Amino acid sequence: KLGDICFSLRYVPTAGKLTVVILEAKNLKKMGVGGLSDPYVKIHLMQNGKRLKKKKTTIKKNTLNPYYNESFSFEVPFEQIQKVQVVVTVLDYDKIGKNDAIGKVFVGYNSTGAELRHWSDMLANPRRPIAQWHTLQVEEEVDAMLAV
């Protein structure tokens, strides 16, 4: 209905290196009245309702099923990795106007369901990259869970 996003997570406790690889999205909802779907993905590191770091992928043109294979890394010490969130948002890009979020998901502290499972798998397996699909959710709901 909104679409799905596949990404991998890897955590290296000694270095405090958290790596997120945005692999692909599928079944994306088309936004706006007309035009084309030009999706990109934002990755935010959060704690206590604050965005600590922001990263984003390149923009793919005219697709509801983009592939990215783009890697991003964050510095999160092992004493703090259980208390952060990684937020993944898919948006429709236009050079004019605020880009509409298609949907988003977060993993980490306070996550649930398949999102918590993905994070728990990462923590249980240091240095192992773990890829999983996630269902995108409306930003209204995800943002309410992330706010303080």
Domains of the chain in sequence order: 1-148 (2.60.40.150)
CB atoms inside a 10 Å sphere around CB 64: 16
CA pseudo-torsion sign 106, 118, 6, 71: positive
- Cβ-contact 10, 58 below 8 angstroms: no
Cα–Cα distance, 60 to 74 (Å, whole number) = 24
Instruction: Write the Ramachandran bin of 49: left for phi over 0, alpha for psi from -120 to 50, otherwise beta.
Output: left
How is residue 128 written in tokens?
A: 């192992």
Report the sign of the C-alpha dihedral through residues 51, 54, 59, 63, in that order: negative
- Stated in angstroms to one decimal place, the resolution of this structure is 1.7
Residues 6+ apart with CB under 8 A from 50: none
* CA pair distance 9, 19, nearest whole angstrom: 6
Cα 14 from Cα 115, distance rounded (Å): 24
From which experimental method does this structure derive? Answer: X-ray
Backbone discontinuities in the chain, residue before each (C to N > 2.5 A): none
Q: Give Cα separations from 148 to 49, 50, 51, 110, 145 (angstroms).
A: 5, 8, 12, 12, 8
In order, the DSSP letters of the chain are ---EEEEEEEEETTTTEEEEEEEEEESPPP-SSSS---EEEEEEEEETTEEEEEEEPPPP-S-SS-EEEEEEEEE--TTTGGG-EEEEEEEE--SSSPPEEEEEEEEETT--HHHHHHHHHHHHSTT--EEEEEE-B-HHHHHHHH--
Q: Which residues pair with 47 in a beta bridge?
A: 50
